[PDB]
């Protein structure tokens, strides 16, 4: 096997001709390209380039594909070096893959002339002037919907009707109803246009923010339908109307990062709740058995010290009651300490995941 | 192109003559300076110097300006190496730029003989003896001003006048007024001298501590003016007198670092308050709908569980009330946990910014 000597700035690197021909379309392998740098006087290919990098670009030839950056070569000087050597776009994506950088930007505009134009208007708000106008209008509509959900349940406005039941009306006299119907009109129109102008109708019931729009529309329609057509469903439907607060996540990049963080960390949250349940059983049992004898004590059950055990460990602190025996006080100081000890353990994993997803936007 | 071989301690580094002449005023490029080190016997320029550094000083010649320190060469040995090679002050500032070190010390004393001398007396307190005397007097005046703002609103001194209104006086009988006027006299004199002796009068309404002095002077003048010349302005003006506590930041280097930290971290504080508002709506709605049926419960509105939701999540804990149902207790333990989970997420960014600005004084 004949040998080839490449001299990158005085540093002689040597290899067998077979190794650099494994990849033939590359700069060193291609006979013609490499011929330019060759110097016939000393039989060596002189190049003037970074010394620490050309070591990694000979490993790629001798290892069938692996591309790993030395830890003392900065990213920019390496990216340029794969380019001069002509290792190919497959190679540079693998280098990006080894530095783990997200590479997905797939935006298939339909390109049917009108579907594409209105999709550009309604999806990407930075594109135009009316796109930012539509973003501002949608955020203000969501905000007044939240304000109607809370001011509706306030009692000061219902005092014309605060009367015993034994004595959503379409009478259009209640102002909360007509402003509520205007909000649901806007949500329905916006969702139907985002359905009919999308470039992928099969994938539309896959994105989670679309399923947030649907479950925000639903309960007003089923209460209108059953009203102009139950008592178990009504208390559930009145609390599925709180999900319009999560429909404010299409316009925020902080709520979307908290959704990624809470998805990618479910094992840690399960460990958090499991450790809490263990500690609550243990400490509530010990305070019940160390304070039951005293005639002036208040713990009357083991499933009655559970609230006291959760508030002392998390530190909110109120308690249903408070220990009055010397023994209850020793099991209450151990409970206070063990609480922060057992809830601070899985939290650094969660904040590290957030910090990663928070800087990956950059 | 003729080639030049430089031998730094046995390690042969080689380059084309063109590369080291790109920068001609430098030590290697200048023919005469480099001629001293040259040894004609072996046609190599022997130098005895650090091996890991001379690699980076050949990249600068071959990369048109980039200067990056290898990660295994300590700062001091590198700083000296750019000096021996004679790369120029533009080069050493760029090295300081790449280690990101603050380089701004612009103090334009006016140099008009008297304006410069009294500016040195009043601005830089370490310069003299009377400068530290003036610093000590200003700090003591600020402290007794805070003591008058709080002891004035105490009620024990007003019990000679605690009478119904239907029955800032310049009568000079109230001792709080005359000591208050002495404090505002000192603030006004000090600010007017710092105006008339400054070397840049156009930039004087740009520094934030100067605007703190002005908004600390203002409300005493407008209440004196309107008194010897409203009922909406009076309750606002009585609370803009609390900014004399921030006028104590010219004499502290910890308050100035907290101001830099809170300026450079506003996106994180916005995320903190936004996450809190989301959690407060969600958990107050769930506890209102899980405890309304019980006839002995106390939550009468969704905008009545808001305080309970803020104190449980932050852990102050008092609550307006406390859950009495099994369902209120499950939505109150989840609220306690999710509070610390959603407020501990943006805080490491803020403490990292503080730690950076806190050690950059060194």
């Amino acid at each position, epitope marked *: 096997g004949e040998r080839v000597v490449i001299n990158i700035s005085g540093l002689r690197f040597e290899t067998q001709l077979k190794t650099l021909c494994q990849f033939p379309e590359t700069l060193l392998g291609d006979p013609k390209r490499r011929m330019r740098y060759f110097d016939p006087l000393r039989n060596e290919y002189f190049f003037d380039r970074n010394r620490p990098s050309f070591d990694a670009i000979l490993y790629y030839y001798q290892s069938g594909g692996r591309i790993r950056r030395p830890v003392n070569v900065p990213i920019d000087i390496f990216s340029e070096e794969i380019r001069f050597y002509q290792l190919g776009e497959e190679a540079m994506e693998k280098f990006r893959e080894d530095e783990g950088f997200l590479r997905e930007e797939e935006r298939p505009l339909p390109r049917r002339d009108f579907q594409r134009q209105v999709w550009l208007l309604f999806e990407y708000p930075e594109s135009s002037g009316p796109a930012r106008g539509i973003a501002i209008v949608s955020v203000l509509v969501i905000l007044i919907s939240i304000v109607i959900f809370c001011l509706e349940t306030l009692p000061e406005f*219902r005092d014309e009707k*605060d*009367y*015993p*039941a034994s004595t959503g009306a379409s009478s259009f006299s209640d102002p909360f109803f007509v402003v509520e119907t205007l909000c649901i009109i806007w949500f329905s129109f916006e969702l139907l246009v985002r359905f009919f102008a999308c470039p992928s109708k099969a994938t539309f019931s896959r994105n989670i923010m679309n399923l947030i729009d649907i479950v925000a529309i639903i309960p007003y329609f089923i209460t209108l339908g059953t009203e102009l057509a139950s008592l178990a469903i009504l208390r559930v439907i009145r609390l599925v109307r709180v999900f319009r607060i999560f429909k404010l996540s299409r316009h925020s990049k902080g709520l979307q990062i908290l959704g990624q963080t809470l998805k990618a960390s479910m094992r840690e949250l399960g460990l958090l709740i499991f450790f809490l349940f263990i500690g609550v059983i243990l400490f509530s049992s010990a305070v019940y058995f160390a304070e039951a004898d005293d005639p002036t004590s208040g713990f009357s059950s083991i499933p009655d010290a559970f609230w006291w055990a959760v508030v002392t460990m998390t530190t909110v602190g109120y308690g249903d009651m408070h220990p009055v025996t010397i023994g209850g006080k020793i099991v209450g100081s151990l409970c206070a300490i063990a609480g922060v000890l057992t809830i601070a353990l899985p939290v650094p994993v969660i904040v590290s995941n957030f910090n990663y997803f928070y800087h990956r936007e950059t | 192109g003729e080639r030049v071989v430089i031998n730094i301690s046995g390690l042969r580094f080689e380059t084309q003559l063109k590369t080291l002449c790109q920068f001609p005023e430098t030590l290697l490029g200048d023919p005469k300076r480099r001629m001293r080190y040259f040894d004609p016997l072996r046609n190599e320029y022997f130098f005895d110097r650090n091996r890991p550094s001379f690699d980076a000083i050949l990249y600068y010649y071959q990369s048109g300006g980039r200067i990056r320190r290898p990660v295994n060469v300590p700062i001091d040995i590198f700083s000296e190496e750019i000096r021996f090679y004679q790369l120029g002050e533009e080069a050493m500032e760029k090295f300081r730029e790449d280690e990101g070190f603050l380089r701004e010390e612009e103090r334009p004393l006016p140099r008009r003989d008297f304006q410069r001398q009294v500016w040195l007396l009043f601005e830089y307190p370490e310069s003299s003896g009377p400068a530290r005397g003036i610093a000590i007097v200003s700090v003591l005046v600020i402290l007794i001003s805070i003591v008058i703002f709080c002891l004035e609103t105490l009620p024990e001194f007003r019990d000679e006048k605690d009478y119904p209104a239907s029955t800032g006086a310049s009568s000079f009988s109230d001792p709080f007024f005359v000591v208050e006027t002495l404090c505002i006299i000192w603030f006004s004199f000090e600010l007017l001298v710092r105006f008339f002796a400054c070397p840049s009068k156009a930039t004087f309404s740009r520094n934030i501590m100067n605007l703190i002095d002005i908004v600390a002077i203002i409300p005493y003048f407008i209440t004196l003016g309107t008194e010897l010349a409203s009922l909406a302005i009076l309750r606002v003006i009585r609370l803009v007198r609390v900014f004399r506590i921030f006028k104590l930041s010219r004499h502290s280097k910890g308050l100035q670092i907290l101001g830099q930290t809170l300026k450079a971290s506003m996106r994180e504080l916005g995320l903190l308050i936004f996450f809190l508002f989301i959690g407060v709506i969600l958990f107050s709605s769930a506890v209102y709908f899980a405890e309304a049926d019980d*006839p002995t419960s106390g939550f*009468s509105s969704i905008p009545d569980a808001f305080w309970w939701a803020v104190v449980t999540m932050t852990t102050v804990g008092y609550g307006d009330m406390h859950p009495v149902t099994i369902g209120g207790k499950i939505v109150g333990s989840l609220c306690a946990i999710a509070g610390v989970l959603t407020i501990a997420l943006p805080v490491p960014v803020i403490v990292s910014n503080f730690n950076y600005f806190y050690h950059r004084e060194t």
Partner: nanobody
Amino acid sequence: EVQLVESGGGLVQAGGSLGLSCSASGLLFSRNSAGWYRQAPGKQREFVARIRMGGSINYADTVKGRFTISRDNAKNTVYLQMNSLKPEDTAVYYCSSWRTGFYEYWGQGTLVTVS
């Protein structure tokens, strides 16, 4: 589980003065709206008084200025002070406390008939 018991009834003559009381357990009145309802013989119940939680008192036209409804806010007690009773009053009375949209509770009844 909850109960609304009341007393103070009987018969009275013209120009009388009396005070029915409503008490309960299983239901703090500090937290719920309450009122007194009467049912004249022959027609449906009408309202004597209402004290919506928060101290807002309203009365019907017949009892205006002759009746007061007060929650001692202590002892879970609501007391009505009727005054100068007239023969049109003859009726059977009832007590109540409710939360709009959730629950409604009644008393057993206690009558006051004016001679």
